[PDB]
């Protein structure tokens, strides 16, 4: 009813030059006539909410993995998309892609443009308040990417109740241009004290948060929805927060333990609602098709298959003004 | 207590070339040792909240007529300043001056810069929502200066209750630069269908509205204050809305009539709160010192002397969230 499976979508990228050079074969198949929902490796078939082949465009991935999320956030649901997989499998290409390229822009910039296109096309007399945060998690410590003096931030939980990173910048935005400025500022700050971004980004989690509140000016109905967009550290062997993420999924998936270890990492505390709580969650598992990476691919697929059995329980986040509470 | 006299401040400009050319004398005196609060003409002394001589700078006028208003609006009071006087007496120079000139910028741009300087210097964890409207009233009809298709707008009164111009643009601003862009857009639109601005601006009322809401993030206290900044049509003989403005002041000043004719014009309906209601109001009466204009100067002074006896009753405009109403 309000009961919502975590969606899991699987994306294979093309075999690349280091793979071919090392003599890798393409070891994965895609059964046809089954809605593009299947992938087979070494004889074993997995079923996901969507499987994307190496040729799938960014627009196709967006239209299937992500689009519904902007419509949901604009209706007052929390939304979360994260990308998971071994380093070099395609997580950043999926989550960010090449910003500003019409073909190769990833999920985040498309989501940003779509939020504002939808708002501009609404007739209803609505007022939107949008703010974004952008931070990194590395070795279980949080660095604010929009304010270099805010390092080692803490995770807290608010009134009613819901976690938050206390002290994290919250930047108001009112056009897609304002958002992309914020993203550029974040990316640039991420380079402070980092000698090799390729290696450092492969070992830390990049968290982009869009908080969208709305007030309906005709009936005073207030709705809010948080959109978490996360590019995770590589899943290869085994980042301590990723162990925690797997233990969380494993516990919710077994469903037979009183204690879900959300507190085992700041990442899983921040994603607590996304993992078995009040958000519509999509995980993009990213995979190489190369024989060389087959065992890592199989762990990725097995992670996604377990997550796909977790159930979230979601509702519209409605707040009441006075008139409801007033009249009582 | 909450009982607040309409402040009246009187500003004389220098004798100008057309005045000297026509053989005007300087016919006004300023008694010293009485706090600069007096002006005498033909033997008759008037007392105001401040009198400014022809040499008074824009900064001096602002520091006395206006500054307190930004502090008030930021504390949740409504604030209104209007300029009144015969064409060529100094109303536009007072209200707007030369925008961008550090010496000659008038009350509006100083108010704009000050609002944002105060916000930036607050420590309290506060969130401000600021929107501006800019419209003209000509022959008792309202034209929106920020949206050329919105002509002939109506005056309505809201829930709790308070008038408003229905349909008037409301532009969100979040820096002084955004405000001055809006002002430039307004000024430029005002020229549509006007063949001579000097004559047309002398016969219409220019209304600049800054609406400032704030939410205190620690205690959920919500405050709001409207700032009306109005440059009126010339007071010479006798714009129908100015007759209405005088009849309103005359009625509140006599205090002995059940019916204050606020509805006699859209101007006095919009200013209803400013005239005997819930706002801190300052009127700048602007006057020429020239013998040639003496009879018009005396009407202006007599208007200001009557307005200065009107009492406003003001309070902080506090709104309650849920927690107050919730718990009951």
């Amino acid at each position: 009813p309000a009961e919502d499976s975590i969606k899991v979508v699987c994306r294979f990228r093309p075999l690349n030059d280091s793979e071919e050079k090392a003599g890798s074969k393409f070891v994965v198949k895609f059964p046809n006539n089954v809605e593009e929902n299947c992938i087979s490796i070494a004889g074993k078939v997995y079923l996901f909410d969507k499987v994307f082949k190496p040729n799938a465009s960014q627009e196709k991935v967006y239209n299937e993995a992500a689009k519904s999320i902007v419509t949901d956030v604009l209706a007052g649901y929390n939304g979360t998309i994260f990308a998971y997989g071994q380093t070099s499998s395609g997580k950043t290409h999926t989550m960010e892609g090449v910003i500003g390229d019409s073909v190769k822009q990833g999920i985040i910039p498309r989501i940003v443009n779509d939020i504002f296109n939808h708002i501009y096309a609404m007739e209803v007399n609505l007022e939107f308040h949008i703010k974004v945060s952008y931070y990194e998690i590395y070795m279980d410590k949080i660095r604010d990417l929009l304010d270099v003096s805010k390092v080692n931030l803490s995770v807290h939980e608010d009134k009613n109740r819901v976690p938050y990173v206390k002290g994290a910048t919250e930047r108001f935005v009112s056009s897609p241009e304002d958002v992309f400025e914020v993203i550029e500022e974040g990316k640039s700050n991420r380079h402070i004290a980092v000698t090799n971004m390729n290696e450092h980004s492969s070992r830390s989690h990049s968290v982009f948060l869009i908080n969208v509140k709305q007030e309906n000016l005709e009936n005073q109905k207030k709705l809010s929805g948080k959109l978490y967009l996360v590019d995770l550290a590589g899943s290869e062997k085994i980042n301590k927060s990723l162990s925690a993420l797997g233990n969380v999924i494993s516990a919710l998936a077994d469903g037979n333990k009183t204690h879900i270890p959300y507190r085992d990492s700041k990442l899983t505390r921040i994603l607590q609602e996304s993992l078995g709580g009040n958000a519509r969650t999509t995980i993009v598992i990213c995979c190489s098709p190369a024989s060389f990476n087959e065992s890592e691919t199989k762990s990725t697929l097995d992670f996604g298959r377990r997550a796909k059995t977790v159930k979230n329980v979601v509702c519209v986040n409605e707040e009441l003004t006075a008139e409801e509470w007033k009249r009582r | 207590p909450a009982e607040d006299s309409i402040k009246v401040v009187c500003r004389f400009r220098p004798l100008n070339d057309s005045e000297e050319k026509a053989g005007s004398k300087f016919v006004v005196k300023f008694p010293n040792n009485v706090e600069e609060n007096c002006i005498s003409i033909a033997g008759k002394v008037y007392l105001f909240d401040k009198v400014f001589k022809p040499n008074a700078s824009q900064e001096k006028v602002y520091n006395e007529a206006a500054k307190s208003i930004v502090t008030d609006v930021l504390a949740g009071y409504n604030g209104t300043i209007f300029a009144y006087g015969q064409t060529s007496s100094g109303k536009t120079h007072t209200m707007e001056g030369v925008i961008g000139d550090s010496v000659k910028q008038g009350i509006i741009p100083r108010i704009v810069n000050d609002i944002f300087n105060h916000i930036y210097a607050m420590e309290v964890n506060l969130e401000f929502h600021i929107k501006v409207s800019y419209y003209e009233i000509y022959m008792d009809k309202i034209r929106d200066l920020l949206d050329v298709s919105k002509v002939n707008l109506s005056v309505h009164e809201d829930k709790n209750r308070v008038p408003y111009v229905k349909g008037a643009t409301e532009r969100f601003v979040s820096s002084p630069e955004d405000v001055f862009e809006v002002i430039e857009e307004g000024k430029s639109n005002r020229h549509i269908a006007v063949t001579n601005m000097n004559e047309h601006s002398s016969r219409s009322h220019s209304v600049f509205l800054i609406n400032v809401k704030q939410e205190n993030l620690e205690n959920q206290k919500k405050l709001s204050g409207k700032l009306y900044l109005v440059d009126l049509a010339g007071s010479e003989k006798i714009n129908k809305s100015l007759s209405a403005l005088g009849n309103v002041i005359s009625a509140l000043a006599d205090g002995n009539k059940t019916h204050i004719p606020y509805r006699d014009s859209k101007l006095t309906r919009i200013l209803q709160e400013s005239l005997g209601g819930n706002a801190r109001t300052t009127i700048v009466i602007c006057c020429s010192p020239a013998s040639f204009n003496e009879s018009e100067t005396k009407s202006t002074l007599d208007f200001g002397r009557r307005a200065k006896t009107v009492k406003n009753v003001v309070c902080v405009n506090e709104e309650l969230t849920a927690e107050e109403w919730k718990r009951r």
């Binding site: 504002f116 096309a121 007399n125 007022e127 939107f128 009112s174 | 506060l126 600021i130």
Partner: peptide
């Protein structure tokens, strides 16, 4: 702790 200015955006 700082005062912030929101940046709402309309439709209608």
């Amino acid at each position: 702790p700082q005062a912030q200015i929101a940046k709402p955006i309309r439709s209608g």
